Amino acid sequence: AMTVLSGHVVVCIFGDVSSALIGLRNLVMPLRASNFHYHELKHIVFVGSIEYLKREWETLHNFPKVSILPGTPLSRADLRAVNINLCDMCVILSANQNNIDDTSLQDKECILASLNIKS
Amino acid sequence: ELEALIAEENALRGGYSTPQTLANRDRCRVAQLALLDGPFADLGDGGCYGDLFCKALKTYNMLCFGIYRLRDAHLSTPSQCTKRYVITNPPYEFELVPTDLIFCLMQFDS
Numbered sequence: 001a002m003t004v005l006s007g008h009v010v011v012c013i014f015g016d017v018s019s020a021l022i023g024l025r026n027l028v029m030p031l032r033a034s035n036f037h038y039h040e041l042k043h044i045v046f047v048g049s050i051e052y053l054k055r056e057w058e059t060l061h062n063f064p065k066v067s068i069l070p071g072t073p074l075s076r077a078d079l080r081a082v083n084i085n086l087c088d089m090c091v092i093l094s095a096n097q098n099n100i101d102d103t104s105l106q107d108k109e110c111i112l113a114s115l116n117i118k119s
Numbered sequence: 120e121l122e123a124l125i126a127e128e129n130a131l132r133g134g135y136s137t138p139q140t141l142a143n144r145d146r147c148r149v150a151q152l153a154l155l156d157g158p159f160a161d162l163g164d165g166g167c168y169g170d171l172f173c174k175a176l177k178t179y180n181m182l183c184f185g186i187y188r189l190r191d192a193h194l195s196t197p198s199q200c201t202k203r204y205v206i207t208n209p210p211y212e213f214e215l216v217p218t219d220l221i222f223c224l225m226q227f228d229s
Contacts, residue, residue, distance in 0.1 A: 075129060076126075076127055077127075077128065077129070
């Protein structure tokens with residue numbers, strides 16, 4: 001909340017320590033291509049469990065502007081801390097898809113997060 | 120409003136006392152009162168429930184809505200059981216015994 005983030009990217013992740021990896025590097029490499037200037041790069045803020053994000057940091061620590069906010073995407077305080085009203089894009093991703101047996105209920109957390117942010 | 124605040128913060132937030140919040144403190148609370156030594160002790164020995172209700176409503180703005188009565192109260196023989204049962208909204212002519220409790224909604228007093 002102390003720092004000011006404007007025109008950035010907020011990646012909300014529904015990760016878990018025992019969840020399967022989704023390979024977040026494939027999201028950061030297109031946004032960190034050399035075709036862009038350094039001042040044109042968009043800050044990336046990952047909002048999610050730190051236990052899951054420590055298992056992915058070995059492929060993300062070589063990129064210039066990446067920050068982590070440990071928390072839950074469904075909490076409004078965390079979203080207000082990263083200035084969700086000023087970001088260029090919010091990306092909601094889910095990692096606990098294999099645990100749910102019913103296929104139609106696999107999108108509950110993403111839909112709830114979208115409705116929470118829109119309200 | 121409290122629901123919205125709890126939704127926003129997922130916790131309870133304190134605050135300094137203001138006259139609006141102090142006025143918000145005044146409500147009514149659920150309580151039980153005994154007739155052994157209270158102001159209504161002279162009426163609990165054979166009096167009717169209607170007089171108790173009317174006096175409580177007129178004097179202390181108290182709403183009586185039930186009797187918590189000893190289980191072994193109708194029996195003539197004495198008993199050591201302290202269990203009590205619930206009588207909800209007794210009629211006007213319902214008799215009272217001194218070993219009774221009255222459900223009430225008591226106003227806040229400062």
